[PDB]
Symmetry: D3
Subunit: 301 residues, 6 copies
Amino acid sequence: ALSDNPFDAKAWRLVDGFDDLTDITYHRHVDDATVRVAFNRPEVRNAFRPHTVDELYRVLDHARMSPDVGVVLLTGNGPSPKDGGWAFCSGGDQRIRGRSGYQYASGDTADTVDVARAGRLHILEVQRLIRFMPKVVICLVNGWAAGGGHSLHVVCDLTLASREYARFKQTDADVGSFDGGYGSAYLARQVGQKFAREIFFLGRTYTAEQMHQMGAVNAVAEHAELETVGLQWAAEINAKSPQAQRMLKFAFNLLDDGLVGQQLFAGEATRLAYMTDEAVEGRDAFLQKRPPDWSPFPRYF
Amino acid sequence: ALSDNPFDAKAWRLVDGFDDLTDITYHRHVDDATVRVAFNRPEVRNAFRPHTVDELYRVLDHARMSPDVGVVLLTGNGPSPKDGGWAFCSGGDQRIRGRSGYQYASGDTADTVDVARAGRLHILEVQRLIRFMPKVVICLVNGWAAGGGHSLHVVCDLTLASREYARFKQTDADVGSFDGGYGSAYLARQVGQKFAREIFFLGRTYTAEQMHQMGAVNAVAEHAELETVGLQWAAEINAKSPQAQRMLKFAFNLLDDGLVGQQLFAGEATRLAYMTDEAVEGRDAFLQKRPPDWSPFPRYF
Amino acid sequence: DNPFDAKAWRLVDGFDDLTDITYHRHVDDATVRVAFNRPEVRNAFRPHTVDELYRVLDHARMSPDVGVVLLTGNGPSPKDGGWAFCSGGDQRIRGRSGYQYASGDTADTVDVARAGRLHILEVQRLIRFMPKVVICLVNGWAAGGGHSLHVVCDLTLASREYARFKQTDADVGSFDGGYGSAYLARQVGQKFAREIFFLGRTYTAEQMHQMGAVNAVAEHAELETVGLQWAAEINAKSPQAQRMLKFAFNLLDDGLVGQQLFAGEATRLAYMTDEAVEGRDAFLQKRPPDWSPFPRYF
Amino acid sequence: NPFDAKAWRLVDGFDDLTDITYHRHVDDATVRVAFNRPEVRNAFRPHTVDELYRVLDHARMSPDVGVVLLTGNGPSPKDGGWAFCSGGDQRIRGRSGYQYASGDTADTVDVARAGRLHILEVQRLIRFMPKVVICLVNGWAAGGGHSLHVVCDLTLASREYARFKQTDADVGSFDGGYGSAYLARQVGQKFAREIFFLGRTYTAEQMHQMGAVNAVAEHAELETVGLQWAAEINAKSPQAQRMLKFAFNLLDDGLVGQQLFAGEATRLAYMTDEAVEGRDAFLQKRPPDWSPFPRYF
Amino acid sequence: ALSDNPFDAKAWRLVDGFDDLTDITYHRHVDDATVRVAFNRPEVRNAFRPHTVDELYRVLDHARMSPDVGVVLLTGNGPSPKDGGWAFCSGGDQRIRGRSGYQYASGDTADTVDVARAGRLHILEVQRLIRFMPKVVICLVNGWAAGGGHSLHVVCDLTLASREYARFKQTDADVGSFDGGYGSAYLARQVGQKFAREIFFLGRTYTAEQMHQMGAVNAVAEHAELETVGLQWAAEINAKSPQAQRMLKFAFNLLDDGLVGQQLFAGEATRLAYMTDEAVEGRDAFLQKRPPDWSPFPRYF
Amino acid sequence: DNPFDAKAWRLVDGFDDLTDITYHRHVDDATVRVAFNRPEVRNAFRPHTVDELYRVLDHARMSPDVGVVLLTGNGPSPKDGGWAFCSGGDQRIRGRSGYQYASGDTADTVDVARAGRLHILEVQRLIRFMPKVVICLVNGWAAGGGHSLHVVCDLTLASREYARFKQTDADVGSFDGGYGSAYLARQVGQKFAREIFFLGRTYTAEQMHQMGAVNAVAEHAELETVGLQWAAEINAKSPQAQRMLKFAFNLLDDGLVGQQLFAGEATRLAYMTDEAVEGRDAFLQKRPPDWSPFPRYF
Ligand SMILES: CC(C)(COP(=O)(O)OP(=O)(O)OC[C@H]1O[C@@H](n2cnc3c(N)ncnc32)[C@H](O)[C@@H]1OP(=O)(O)O)[C@@H](O)C(=O)NCCC(=O)NCCSC(=O)c1ccc2ccccc2c1O
Ligand SMILES: CC(C)(COP(=O)(O)OP(=O)(O)OC[C@H]1O[C@@H](n2cnc3c(N)ncnc32)[C@H](O)[C@@H]1OP(=O)(O)O)[C@@H](O)C(=O)NCCC(=O)NCCSC(=O)c1ccc2ccccc2c1O
Ligand SMILES: CC(C)(COP(=O)(O)OP(=O)(O)OC[C@H]1O[C@@H](n2cnc3c(N)ncnc32)[C@H](O)[C@@H]1OP(=O)(O)O)[C@@H](O)C(=O)NCCC(=O)NCCSC(=O)c1ccc2ccccc2c1O
Ligand SMILES: CC(C)(COP(=O)(O)OP(=O)(O)OC[C@H]1O[C@@H](n2cnc3c(N)ncnc32)[C@H](O)[C@@H]1OP(=O)(O)O)[C@@H](O)C(=O)NCCC(=O)NCCSC(=O)c1ccc2ccccc2c1O
């Protein structure tokens, strides 16, 4: 009766238009305003290749533009059919990593790499998409989270982790790589500079409880219940003012993201201003080629 | 023998000139350089209305300008005479909240709102007064700390919380509101970005011990001893160089507050320069209409 | 000639007791005039001056029928005909602990029991944080703390003939290590700002305009007339938008304080929506809120 | 007319564009992207924004393109007026933002569909793309149109017809992001506040004096000079140009800025033998040998 | 058998050229790419005087420039021969502190102070050296860490602390001093603003375990094993890509250090660019006085 | 015509061994002159040049009788009469690991066992952090890293006739991604700074002055004479105030490092007080401190 798999097929439906997905799965909950986005290459611990990043971007972007979706659950499928091992995401697929970055290939191995096509590092675009979308993204760490996979959990708004199977391991420097952006600096804004430097410089494996104690993981859950708890967290988020939740996310981003953070938060303020009679008077005055009349609108202080 | 009330009336005296306070109480300790500032509307869990904010500002401002006061203890009176419930502060009084913010009213309910008078959100001014005053402000959370009340706690330099009665709950998004300034972004600089986002996005109730573990509460105390512990903390603060304590507070504020932070710290540096013979030579040379002589004052490196 | 046109201005009720500052409301416009009134010492401010200045600016901030503040200096000097906006802190009553309250004009009347203050910094923040445009009209010398006040204002207009900018801080052993210096660098760039402070030279209106700290140069007699024209153009726009724009300009430079002020106004904007009103109503009626009428935007 | 048709070719796959034009230079690694609604001073509606994003994104991913020229077509067939871009099309502005419509006017708005403000997405795309974007202001630049020039890396402006006018507060709108705060990092806080608070009209020469316009050119020569600038840019080390742009963005853009600059530093490390040894060791399931690679200081 | 001393004399060799050191010791490990740098005035709890600072800077600078050294262990020798008391570092030597700062003296006490020579506060230069050097610096807190000694610990990349003997006490304000830089503001980026303010404003003594719980100490070790654990941590660090480790340290520093942070990280990016064929084409074209040919080098995105 | 007036300058004791740099102290003023001395390669620096430049600037930093550093280039070139401030890194000894030490002048003599360095960045930080005003006198070409050196100096004066600013970094596949670029933008604004780097055009003294990166333009023969005048005006003010001001200008731009330096100086001011001394004395006398004589200021 105890399931080894967090996924409950009865609770989830495929999303229309996404039959061609190979490296990623995308479900919408049967009742809730919540979607499930998951890595789908468990044979390589859910390592992503450039095509994986493209699918992940497409799917997250679709969720961003779905008005009836409030929360994204980001996770990994499994286990490995080869050894039963569990993974959230093991970062960039090393098999198709070249001197210019991760390269598109016709097959799974290095020999099928299109040598004419320069490599990319555009998981960074997925990071920004997660960061900038006006919806809460909750990472469900159901297994190994290593390299770029570790950095993905870091950039999510919230993280829940499997007690039995979550393993956090920043392996970047082991393979001569490094996430010098959100993966490292933003980790320091969750667990502090000392712990963050330890995690990267020594590359040790941490449990869910250890990461929770340090401040990068919000709560620990039983593996079988990880998505159930995820859905409960999403339900609590979706039960509040969506307008307030949106502003709050951009408020938490703002200063850390400089002018970009201000752009997003100020953008939402501009939308709020557009709803007002005062802004409509401004529009109407222009269209009617007359001076605007601001006298009904007080100078708040 | 066990008091349900943290307040020890024998230890405190009313402050002269504060006759007319209705929403707030203001005491000076009988021996120590410490004052007690408290919300005084326990029947509504110490929610503040614009008049409450005005009294609070005036009282904190007086404490700021009192040379014989080193530490402010900010707390809530209680319990509710209606149900015996304890509160530090439950944020803005929802009864007089309008479309333009919290509105002045002649009575307690929405019907007595002065409709000719625009709403205000100027608890933010109290936040800055606490932030900018050259004295340590310790928040003693003696009960519910919710909404704007939670955010007041966040902005204080230090927080002590009642074991039995403190309950931290960020209810902003529940009533369609949000503190997008110190309430949220500054919380993240105490407990890290993941926990701060959790606290706001889910709006769960946290105990003193839980908040202490996350990093927003300095210590947990027995309810009956909360002000006693507060006074002990104040005494330790007051036993150090007042000049060093002043500079240290502005040093902690500085970068987080940008140019405002620099302004406050540099302002105190200017005062230190004014104490020197070199600065006195500059003033005198101008007043005597002669060139200054800097030769007695060596260059340091 | 004199930039002050007495016919255009009325005294503000409740301010009969002002000694170091004058305060007028325009006869027709949503504009006030705030001016230093010690031209015999080049409009140097003492602590009492600062108190009056703060109180008057605070009153303008809280006047809903006022949109723009014009900050300037009265003159000329009755002693030598010299023109000044403001020459900074009154050096006569500067002590080792800062500028001190005194019953008279000189150090001999200083209240020795009372520590000195530097709370022009409080006026700077009041100017910086108020949800209204403050225009500095530099009608003469602007030196020391007076120079730093023009720097922190949103806009500066300057008298062609008589405006003189001179950062004399380091000459008398002082320094504005806040807005006076760092924020000046965000107007004229780090090289020019360092020059202005390190060498303490005198600059004309036109020179400051070329460097970027002065918005426009006006004829002396027309300085307040041009100020009123600028104020009128500002007052012809959405007050809501002007308010948001000022705080947007402040935001990143002011860190968490900047975010607090801008987000504070964003919160007011949310409070105006039906969605926020449903949040209030549900709490008051002790029922669950119903968010279904309010769509998610992206 | 600044447009020289002989110098430009249409780009394959963009036959369906209606609000925007998109050309590639016949010889140079340079593209031309232009607003194409001159009858309303090149105001953009959400469809314009979608086309603009799609086109700039394509330019970003085109390895044989080094520089983007962003401008407006004209003149107005109605009054001969010249415009770069007048910002959001006010006719279809609603309480929820700019709304999709089947026609040009408010009565054709799809009421079932919420409005958007996603010109901000185009701003970020210009900002984050590893190529220089030069704005050619050939006419009116107002509202969101003014803000689009602000966010471009460089701006060249028509002496006779460029008109800069930040009208945001006139119509109760505001760009509280790059449009204003970033303008201040070009012309300084005093001038930026003046531009927004008063919303006056400025010439090319005035904006050049303030620091927001790199150079003024004769109207007929505006695109010719743009192409000359693009050529000088394309003649340098592309790797260095790329690093330079993100270095300029970095601190102003906080963690996002660091992410972009560090992303390119990561690529540079991937080129090294040391990084390749890291990949090889993992793939071959053996310990890495770092001894051939010395520590630098 | 149980050693009271963390130092294992068999594991360390003196470094050539440092025979003249008096206030500091400097060893290189017999096998590992690791050095040991230690305060050597245990009779005054390893308080530093200006000569100590000069030696410390010299030794750390030499380590910075040693290509075969990857990690610096920074600690204190002991115990005091007077009372057996243990110290990492008790900050500035108060005996030779004057009105212009810490002063050079021929002897140990104030009467041998060179009055003609202005005082200095240049432990700040050692702080920046630790901060900016492209190698991990691990602080081994083997006893008291107080005042400026506490701040040195704060600025190191990692801290390990002796269970039995580590005592953290920020005493600055007790003696009228303050570290308004890394000592305070950077501490806040490790333990959060509330705990950081508490540490300074109250100046209480904290254990290794307490500082670890707050986030300023990475791990607690047995006193006899402190340097053994230090060596184990260094070995894990030294087993990764040295290039990646370097980039990662400056990535963690970057935003916190503004333009200085950008300068250091960008400098390393420039070195990486110099390794490329493209950069070499740039150099060669200039030297051969011909136009560069960039056509072999793809634009990446 | 030469800007250098030999009569005004004396060699500094202990610096006889300098080869790539010259170092003089003024015969009367608290001012030194530090100059690149390889005019045959447009004053391009090699690693040895950087070491000498650091040592000389460090010595000036620690000299209590020196207030101002004038940083410039010697010339003209004995080969073609060309004038240079500094053309950046010596490309002849640039390798894949950076600029390399060599026994001779050319690439064939580089020590292959010794990795390259980019440590002109250390000189930039030394200029940036030293508590004294550094004025760059651009007497000729300023290119690459040489351009970045002027950018990081506090003030820049430039020769009308011979100053030439040209950011050639991207021409040779290099880039200054720190103070050279990002800090230039805080002088001339983001548009002009991007223009300067992306196109790498040559600009005159007058053009750079208009953009905001050059404080003043001077006649070539008078460049050091004007430099000495600027230094004299700087040296006539409170040294303590000038010091605080420089770190105040640095502060926010330099994050925790900026704060560290400014607060460090504030700590020194505090050490001068009776209050700080009571703290010391109480510790030394093993007694509680008595803070009662020292008032709380606000
Ligand atoms: C360039 C002038 C403005 C005009 O000179 P002029 O030749 O035209 O007239 P002058 O003879 O100097 O002045 C006329 C009368 O006014 C007096 N006076 C002018 N300014 C002041 C003044 N600030 N304080 C006291 N008296 C002043 C003069 O002494 C003189 O008095 P009289 O001989 O008729 O008896 C010149 O007077 C002057 O340099 N005055 C001093 C400017 C000054 O150093 N102000 C204060 C420096 S510091 C500062 O303002 C300040 C304040 C608060 C701060 C807070 C935080 C951080 C920094 C702060 C700060 O830097
Ligand atoms: C200064 C002009 C550009 C030139 O005036 P001119 O006197 O030469 O010609 P005019 O007769 O006014 O315009 C010619 C035709 O084009 C129309 N037109 C011009 N601009 C627009 C326009 N923006 N929207 C709709 N129609 C426009 C005019 O109504 C007119 O139509 P007609 O009566 O001949 O049939 C003037 O047209 C004008 O003020 N246009 C409006 C400028 C404007 O306020 N744009 C919107 C500001 S708000 C905005 O762009 C925007 C968008 C997204 C944002 C996202 C986040 C944050 C902020 C945002 C934002 O602020
Ligand atoms: C907590 C202790 C470290 C341990 O106390 P314990 O109870 O174990 O034994 P104790 O009797 O106090 O010390 C044993 C011997 O060591 C001496 N000693 C300990 N620390 C110092 C010390 N720092 N300076 C001079 N002597 C010291 C003691 O006086 C005593 O001497 P003895 O009576 O045998 O002759 C305690 O000694 C103590 O508080 N020491 C002072 C800590 C302190 O306040 N240091 C200076 C704060 S300021 C700071 O370090 C500093 C320095 C440079 C800075 C530069 C720029 C900006 C900031 C700076 C800065 O903040
Ligand atoms: C614009 C000139 C300065 C003047 O041109 P002109 O036509 O007047 O004279 P020219 O014939 O080019 O030069 C005269 C002699 O001096 C030589 N020369 C001039 N500059 C250099 C030079 N920098 N290195 C080596 N030789 C140089 C010339 O090769 C030539 O040698 P000759 O033919 O007599 O044997 C031109 O010479 C020139 O562009 N020189 C190279 C400028 C350059 O690209 N420098 C390196 C950019 S990168 C850089 O400096 C640098 C260094 C360290 C960094 C560290 C961290 C981050 C960034 C860094 C960085 O960007």
